[PDB]
Structure formats: C-alpha cells, structure tokens
Amino acid sequence: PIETVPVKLKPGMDGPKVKQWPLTEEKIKALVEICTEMEKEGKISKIGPENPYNTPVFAIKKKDSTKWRKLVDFRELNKRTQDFWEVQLGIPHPAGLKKKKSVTVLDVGDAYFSVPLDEDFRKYTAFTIPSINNETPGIRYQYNVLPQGWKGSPAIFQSSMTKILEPFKKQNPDIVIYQYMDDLYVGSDLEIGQHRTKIEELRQHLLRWGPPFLWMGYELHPDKWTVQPIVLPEKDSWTVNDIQKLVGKLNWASQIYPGIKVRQLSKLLRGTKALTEVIPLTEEAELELAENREILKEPVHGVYYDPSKDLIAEIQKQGQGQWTYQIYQEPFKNLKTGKYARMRGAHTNDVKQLTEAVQKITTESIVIWGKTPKFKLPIQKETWETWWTEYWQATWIPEWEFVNTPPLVKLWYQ
Amino acid sequence: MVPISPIETVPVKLKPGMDGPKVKQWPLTEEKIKALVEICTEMEKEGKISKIGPENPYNTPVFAIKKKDSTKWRKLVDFRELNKRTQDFWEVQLGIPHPAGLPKNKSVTILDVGDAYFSVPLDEDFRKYTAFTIPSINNETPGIRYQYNVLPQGWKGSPAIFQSSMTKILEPFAAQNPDIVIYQYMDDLYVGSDLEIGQHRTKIEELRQHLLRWGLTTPDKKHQKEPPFLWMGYELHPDKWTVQPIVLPEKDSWTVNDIQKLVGKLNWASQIYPGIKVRQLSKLLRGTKALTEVIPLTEEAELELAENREILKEPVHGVYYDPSKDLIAEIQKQGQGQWTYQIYQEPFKNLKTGKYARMRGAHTNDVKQLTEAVQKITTESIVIWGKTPKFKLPIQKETWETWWTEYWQATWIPEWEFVNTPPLVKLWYQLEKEPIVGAETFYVDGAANRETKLGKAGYVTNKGRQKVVPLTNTTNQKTELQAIYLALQDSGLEVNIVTDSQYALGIIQAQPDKSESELVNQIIEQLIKKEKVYLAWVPAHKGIGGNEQVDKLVSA
Ligand SMILES: Cc1cc(/C=C/C#N)cc(C)c1Oc1nc(NC2CCN(Cc3ccc(S(C)(=O)=O)cc3)CC2)nc2ncccc12
Ligand SMILES: [Mg+2]
Numbered sequence A: 001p002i003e004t005v006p007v008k009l010k011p012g013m014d015g016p017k018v019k020q021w022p023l024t025e026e027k028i029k030a031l032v033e034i035c036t037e038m039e040k041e042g043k044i045s046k047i048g049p050e051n052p053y054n055t056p057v058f059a060i061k062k063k064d065s066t067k068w069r070k071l072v073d074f075r076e077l078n079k080r081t082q083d084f085w086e087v088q089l090g091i092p093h094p095a096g097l098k099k100k101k102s103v104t105v106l107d108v109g110d111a112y113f114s115v116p117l118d119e120d121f122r123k124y125t126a127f128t129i130p131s132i133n134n135e136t137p138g139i140r141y142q143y144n145v146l147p148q149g150w151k152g153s154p155a156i157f158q159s160s161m162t163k164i165l166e167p168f169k170k171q172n173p174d175i176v177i178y179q180y181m182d183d184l185y186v187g188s189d190l191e192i193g194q195h196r197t198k199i200e201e202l203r204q205h206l207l208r209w210g211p212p213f214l215w216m217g218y219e220l221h222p223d224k225w226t227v228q229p230i231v232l233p234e235k236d237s238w239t240v241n242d243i244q245k246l247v248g249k250l251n252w253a254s255q256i257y258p259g260i261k262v263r264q265l266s267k268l269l270r271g272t273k274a275l276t277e278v279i280p281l282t283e284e285a286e287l288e289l290a291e292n293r294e295i296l297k298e299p300v301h302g303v304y305y306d307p308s309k310d311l312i313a314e315i316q317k318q319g320q321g322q323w324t325y326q327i328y329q330e331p332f333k334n335l336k337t338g339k340y341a342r343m344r345g346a347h348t349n350d351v352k353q354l355t356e357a358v359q360k361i362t363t364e365s366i367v368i369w370g371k372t373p374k375f376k377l378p379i380q381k382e383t384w385e386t387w388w389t390e391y392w393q394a395t396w397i398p399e400w401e402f403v404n405t406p407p408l409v410k411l412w413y414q
Numbered sequence B: 001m002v003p004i005s006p007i008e009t010v011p012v013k014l015k016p017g018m019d020g021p022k023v024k025q026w027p028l029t030e031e032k033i034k035a036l037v038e039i040c041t042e043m044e045k046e047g048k049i050s051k052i053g054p055e056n057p058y059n060t061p062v063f064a065i066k067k068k069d070s071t072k073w074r075k076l077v078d079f080r081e082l083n084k085r086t087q088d089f090w091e092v093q094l095g096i097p098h099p100a101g102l103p104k105n106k107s108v109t110i111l112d113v114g115d116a117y118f119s120v121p122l123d124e125d126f127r128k129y130t131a132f133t134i135p136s137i138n139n140e141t142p143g144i145r146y147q148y149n150v151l152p153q154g155w156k157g158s159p160a161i162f163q164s165s166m167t168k169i170l171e172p173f174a175a176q177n178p179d180i181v182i183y184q185y186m187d188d189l190y191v192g193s194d195l196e197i198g199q200h201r202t203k204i205e206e207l208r209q210h211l212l213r214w215g216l217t218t219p220d221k222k223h224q225k226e227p228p229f230l231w232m233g234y235e236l237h238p239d240k241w242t243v244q245p246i247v248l249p250e251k252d253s254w255t256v257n258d259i260q261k262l263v264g265k266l267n268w269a270s271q272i273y274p275g276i277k278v279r280q281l282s283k284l285l286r287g288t289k290a291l292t293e294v295i296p297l298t299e300e301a302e303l304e305l306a307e308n309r310e311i312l313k314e315p316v317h318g319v320y321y322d323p324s325k326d327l328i329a330e331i332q333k334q335g336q337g338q339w340t341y342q343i344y345q346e347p348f349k350n351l352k353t354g355k356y357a358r359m360r361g362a363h364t365n366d367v368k369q370l371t372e373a374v375q376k377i378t379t380e381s382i383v384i385w386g387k388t389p390k391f392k393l394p395i396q397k398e399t400w401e402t403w404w405t406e407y408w409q410a411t412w413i414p415e416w417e418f419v420n421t422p423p424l425v426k427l428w429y430q431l432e433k434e435p436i437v438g439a440e441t442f443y444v445d446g447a448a449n450r451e452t453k454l455g456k457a458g459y460v461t462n463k464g465r466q467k468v469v470p471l472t473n474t475t476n477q478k479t480e481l482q483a484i485y486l487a488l489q490d491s492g493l494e495v496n497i498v499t500d501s502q503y504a505l506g507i508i509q510a511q512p513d514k515s516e517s518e519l520v521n522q523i524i525e526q527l528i529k530k531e532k533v534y535l536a537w538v539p540a541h542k543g544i545g546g547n548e549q550v551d552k553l554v555s556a
Helices: A025-040 A075-080 A109-114 A152-171 A192-208 A240-254 A263-267 A283-295 A350-369 A381-390 B030-045 B080-085 B124-130 B158-175 B197-214 B256-269 B279-285 B299-311 B366-384 B397-406 B476-489 B502-508 B518-529 B547-554
Strands: A044-046 A057-060 A069-072 A102-107 A127-129 A139-143 A176-180 A183-188 A218-220 A312-319 A322-328 A334-340 A374-377 A400-402 B049-051 B062-066 B073-077 B107-112 B132-134 B144-148 B180-185 B188-193 B229-231 B234-236 B241-243 B328-335 B338-346 B349-357 B390-393 B416-418 B440-448 B455-461 B466-471 B494-499 B532-537
Touching (some): A025 A057, A025 A069, A025 A127, A025 A139, A102 A192, A152 A192, A183 A192, A183 A350, A240 A263, A240 B532, A263 A283, A322 A350, A334 A350, A350 A374, A350 A381, A381 A400, A381 B366, B030 B062, B030 B132, B062 B132, B107 B197, B124 B144, B158 B180, B188 B197, B256 B279, B328 B366, B349 B366, B440 B476, B440 B547, B455 B476, B455 B547, B466 B547, B476 B494, B476 B502
Parallel strands (some): A312 A374, A374 A400, B328 B390, B494 B532
Antiparallel strands (some): A102 A183, A102 A218, A127 A139, A176 A183, A322 A334, B062 B073, B107 B188, B132 B144, B180 B188, B328 B338, B440 B455, B455 B466
C-alpha cells in the first residue's frame, strides 16, 4: 500500500461541518486512550485551526465485548463523497447470500488501517474529542489511512480484498462472500459445526495476509427469517366488535390485495347493536370470509425492488417486547415484513429495544439488498437523540425520521 | 542571546476562486496622518509590520480614532473586506464553561499574556493580503505601504490562531502539572490550583519559566481582580457563584423592547434563581417585530412578573462541583406547560437551577412534558458535568409504569425515584382495551358542507337513544369531535363509542390532557368523569350497521 487513490467530493459540495454532540466522561476517556494509540501508530494526526470541518465521534461496545471501540458518524461525509467507480463500475448484490442457511458477519475494518489515505482528502475526515463543560478545547484529529465507516474505505481496499480472498474462494466455490463497509458476510449451506471451524480459516487469513475485533463472529440464518402474511381470525362465535375489527382489517388489506370484499360481512351488522352481542355467521358471509382468506394466501403482485429508490422501514410498538416492521419503497407494497420479541437486555427499556430492532432490520436489509433503509421511528426526536448511542453496537449508522402521529394500521400488523 | 523556539505558523488560504481585498484608502486629515505614521513606526520597530513596495496590489483602509479617556489617536485597520474573503477556521471558543461545573480551586493567579497576543507570527504566504496604505501629506507623495507580520487585531482568523497557538504552547505544562488549572481569556491567563499558597506560586514561577522558552515574558497582571470575578455575566467567588445583579425595572409604558430585555434577564437569572416563569411575559411577543411598539400587560403577565420580583428580591448563590458526590436533579410542575428544576449534590445547596417551557403544539399531556424536561436536563448535565444525574420526579412509579407500557411510542427516562411534591403528574384517563359488557353502545358521526359551513353531529345507540344537533360555521373534522363529545355527555359511567373518524382517533390516541382546541378540552373533561370508555374505529361508507344509520342522519 504505497500510492493513494485520488478521491474528492461531489461537484459544488463542501466538506462536512457537523457538530459534535456531548459525551459522558467515561466515553471521552475511552476515546482519548484509543486516539493516543492510533496517533502513535500513524493512523491519525493532530490538526490546526485552519481545518474547519468536523465529523461526530463516540464510543461503543460491540456485542459480547469489554473494551471500547471508536465509532465515527461518517453519514454526512459519505453522502458528500463522490461516487466510486473502480475498474468495474459496480457489482450487483449477491442474491444467494439471503438464500444460504448460515451467514457469519466478520469485522474486517482493521484491514483498512494499512492503506494510506489521499493527502488531499484527509482534512475532510476531521473529528473532535469533546471536552467536558468547555473547560478545554476539543482534541482535533484527522485520518491518515482509510477510516472505518467511510464508504470509500471498502471501495478502495476492494482491489486488495479480492486477492486476500482469492485462495479461499477457489477452495470453496459454493461460499457466498459479500462486503458492506467494515463487515464481511460469509454464507454457506454447511452445518454450524463445519461452518464455525471454516469461518476461523478466514480469520488467520487476515492475520497472515495482513486485528482486535477479528475474533468475534455474528451468526445469522437468513434461511429461517420469518415472513408475516395477513392472517384473519378463526372463531366459532363472532361479536359485533369482532366483525367490526374484521371488516376494518379487510378494508385495510383491500388496498394491498385486489378482490377483497366486505359486503356480506357488513350485512351482519344490522343497525345499532351492542358491541358484545354475538352475531351468527350467514352462509353468504362465511363464503366471503373464505374467499378473502384464500386471497390473502397469495403474495402481493407487482412488487419489485428498485435500486434507484430508497428503502423505507416502519416500526410499530406492539407491547410486551414485541415489535413489528415492514420494508418497502412504495406504500402497500412490502418487500419484507417481520416481528421481533424477547429483546435481550431490555424488558423495562423501550429505547434499547427499539435500538436493537433498528440494527437487526438494517442487517437484514444489507443481506437482502446491500443497502440500509430510511427508518420511520415511533419515538419523539429528543428521546431518541439522547439515548440511541448508548445501545448502538453496529459499525454503520442508517438514516431515520420520527413519527409523531399514532398509526391506525398498528392493530392490523399485530 | 538566549535561544527561543519559534511559534509555528498556521497555513491560511483565501476562499476558493476569490482574490485579496483592493479597497481604496479614504482621505485623512493632516493630524490623523501624522498620528498613524508615528504609530506604524513604533510597530515596525517591534517587527509587527513591514514596509512593502509598489508591486503589492492589495489594500485595506486604515483609520484614526481618538478616545476621551486618553488624548491619543488609535490605529484601526478595517479588515471587513479581507475577512469576507478569508477561509473559515475551527473556532475553538464557541462556548464558555458553566460555573456550576467548575471544581473549587483555592488559589488563582492572573498572568498577562499580551506579550504573545501581538507576537504570534502570520503565515508568510498570506501577508500580501493584509497590506494597508497611510495617505501622504497633501497627496504629493506616494503613501507609506505596510503589511502585517503578526496576527492583526480584527482579522477573521486572529482569535482562532492565537488560542490554538497558546494551547499548543501550554500543552506540555498542563500534562505534567495535572494539579494546575489554566483558562485563557483575551490577553489574560487565569492559573488556579488547590495547592497551598506556597506551592502554588512555585508552579506559577515554573509556568513563567516554561513560557520564556518562546520568548514570552509573562508578569503578574497589575491590579489583580478583587473577588468576585466579573466574567461572562457571573460573580465567581472562591466558594460560591451567582449571576451579576438582576434588577427588574418598574415602568408604566412597557414596549416589546422592554420585555425582550426583561425575559432575557429572567432567562439568565433562571439558572440560579429557582421558580422563574416567563410564559405570560414572552406570550406577548408572538409576532411583534417593531421593537418600539407598546403592548398592554395582561393580568396573567402582571401576576407572573409579581412572582418573579419576590424571587429576585433576595440574592441566592450556587455551589461548585464535587466529583466525589452524587449528581441529583429534581423537577416541579408550575402549570401552563412550565417546569422548573434544581440540580444539587447536598440538600438545600444547589449547583444550579433551570426551567423548561412546553413545545408549541396543539395537544399535550404532563407525562410527555415531564419526559421532555428530563431529556433536556440529561443533555445539559452531560455538557456541564459529563454524566447523567439521578432524577427526583413528581410522578408515582405505578403511574409511569402504566404510561410507558401502554403508550404507542417508545419512551424512557433514566434512573429516577418518586418525590411527593404536589402537584403530581397523573394519568387523567385510560381507555379500555376490550368492549365493555353491559355498557350502552353509541354510534357517532358528523358531517359538514364545505361551502355553507353548516353541519350536523350526533349519535344512535343500541337502546334506541338518538340525538342529532345542527351546527353552524363548522368543518367535517369539527363535527366528528362534536359527535364524540355528545356521546360522552349523554352516556352513563361506562360507554362504548363507535366512530369512523381517523382524525378523532389520532387525537385521542395521543392521550392529551389539555388542548388549544376548546372542543377537545371539553372531551377531555368528559373522559375524566367516566369510569370506563371503549373507543372503537370502523371504516366509513361500508354498510356497517349503526354507523350507516347515523351517517345518513348527519349528512342532511
Ligand atoms: C481559572 C478560571 C477562571 C475563570 C475566570 C476568571 C475571570 N474573570 C473562568 C474559568 C472557567 C476558569 O477555569 C477553571 N476554573 C476552575 N475553577 C474555578 C472555581 C473558583 N473560581 C472562583 C475564584 C476562586 C478564587 C479566587 S481568589 C482571587 O484567588 O480569591 C477568585 C475566584 C475560580 C476557579 N476550575 C477549572 N477546572 C478545569 C478547567 C478550567 C477551570
Ligand atoms: Mg361520516
């Protein structure tokens, strides 16, 4: 790694000037020790006041780990950085990664610190270790190598990455290998006993061809990812309220499915009746319920992924640690639906549960489509902005907006 | 000649595509010219400026100002044009420390660092752009042309580059003297410590010795500040701190400028004076722009101002931070969306106080506001102290548990415990999850003509009860809320209500206890009186019994 690839920003765009948010003393102390070591290793250098850019930074702890890790919010720099075209202009996402029965996620971000960064672009990676109570100026650094979390780091190390994996690819041709940012997604159809041992064969490859967090390995099983089709109740006695909610759910599904009819079920509601009164099903109503039930078995038609459009993810809080979600690009055309429950570590903390939910949905979006979705979060902005960094454990950060009006379709994804 | 190490220069560039300034020198009188010549001759001896030839094409105008305190002229080089063309810098003084976050430092010494204030070298490639011309006597001679060699007082990058350079100079001393506190303020260095008075001046002489490595003679500032320090609007005593005296004027003609300075003083005083409110006072400047317009004082504003004068009658003081003790924050509700809080470590002795006003919305509840206040205090505490405080909140543990487990949004407040300080935050109504057996079932609906603004609203029930009310100057959304209000008004203690209004559902499912809409407030008052209320939603115009009957009754 001698020469540096010339990179720049988008035409008519300046560097990132993002405010560093406050940090607790424990996280500041951790960032100081981490950056002191990175400075000795030449990875970062101090900068002067002639550098007006800034990118936020904070400290996290990955899943099942004790030592801190520096995480840099390169979201603004990434969207202002030029689009990268190598000798190949682009790789289509491997559709087989989501089809394998086991996918292990390996952090390979440590391999980036061996490739220098273009000296003209280093000023744009400026970040500040904040001080407490403005008592001292912030310790200002910039990067000298490829930084973790920058979109250009895998788009530059990709030439070197193809050669490190070339020996392992030839030995196992039925293994799908995909890279997103600092992570490496390795999928196969072999058993976990043969998978875990084979995964460690790649760990020593980075040790020989070139890490602290290389030991950890997050295991996924995309073959056992659940889908949430629309289901209708099966009862023997229906109250007025049961039928009202049923017709409501069917009317909502009629936007997604063609041919949903509620006429015969609406006939059962004969004027003003008590909500708790049992209404017997007629033959015309039972056949209408049966026809709608067969319609809901088939998937939605005209549902396609568009690489040019954004992926949108909405989340609903269902109570008792249960969260539902849908991924789409056009309304009422879900590409993926799911439900989460029994969130680890948070049974009295709503925000930690939502934070883990966002990370899991993002991971699924990377495995399936190779990019992250824009989240619509059921939480007030001030509460989420105060606490999400306390529970974050991924090396990437998606975008998000805030929903301030209660959705009515919540009771229908339940 | 004792060798002194040089101060590293900061590389400076103009903005991309722009050139240096080329402003014409204004005509100056014969006495101003002679003054500037003598001034610039002194500065040239000190190496601060240097004469230049005619090839330099840049120029900024220079002026001569005279003061009344001392009968002397002063040089002023207008760098407004150069600053517009100078790059942006990383300003390292955006914020100031809050006194409540400072630890007690027994001994403090003030040092004069003005010897370095006008001695930081400027980037050699940038001095071209700082050129200025002294006009000559009677314009019969080419004017004297100078350019700066050091940071010019007034240039865009002078504050940032100076503070950066001083910080780099001081860095090794502070690192090897952790028991020493240093704060930069213009041309004065404040060096404090918790050491005995003997060992303190020992390290001060060591700081003088370290600063001499760069040729910076730093004597003790003459006429050292008598306590308290008057700094950035505070009074810094060795053991206490407060804001500078806040006095409220007693006027009869109150203009909007008087209130802008009144709320400003009240906001500034609210960081130590507990219980300050500024709602009804700042409520009077909703859309005013004319700073000279007079506005009458409402009876709520006069009553609010009277409460503040009593609070500001006696001065109160705050204490300094002790890292060895816990950080505790306590909140109280004040009404009309106003909250006040105190942060302390020992009881009755506050580090600081504060307040929180509710965000401008249409519907709200106390639990949401208290939660917003908690996040504000949490963020402020991490700024000031670097940690989250323990919260004392006027809300029952059971009330909070019931709220967050049933609220549709994710929500969370950090470690907190209940403090029985009325008025307590309460849940004023809770809707049912399933329909109520034995309770009358009201099917409600409303409708209005968009052109004539005439509408109808009412209900039909399973017991035959009916009502339809004619309405004037109304909307579709308004008649939908009115229909629900009528159902609550004419029902017993328990009631099932069936509506098709997605709009009304969204309002009620937000669980407000107060609203800007008078109709919504009437609904809330009705909800509080009930024992059980189940609210059901159905799609409209779908042949649903009861819903379709009342739909035909309200559509005229
Ligand atoms: C040193 C300093 C001065 C000023 C303003 C001066 C003016 N104008 C402002 C700040 C922020 C500042 O910086 C820091 N200050 C402190 N502590 C404070 C707490 C007590 N105050 C009041 C006081 C005590 C004694 C006397 S005396 C004459 O000797 O009786 C007089 C006044 C001074 C030191 N700790 C710090 N820690 C870490 C980093 C910086 C610290
Ligand atoms: Mg209607």
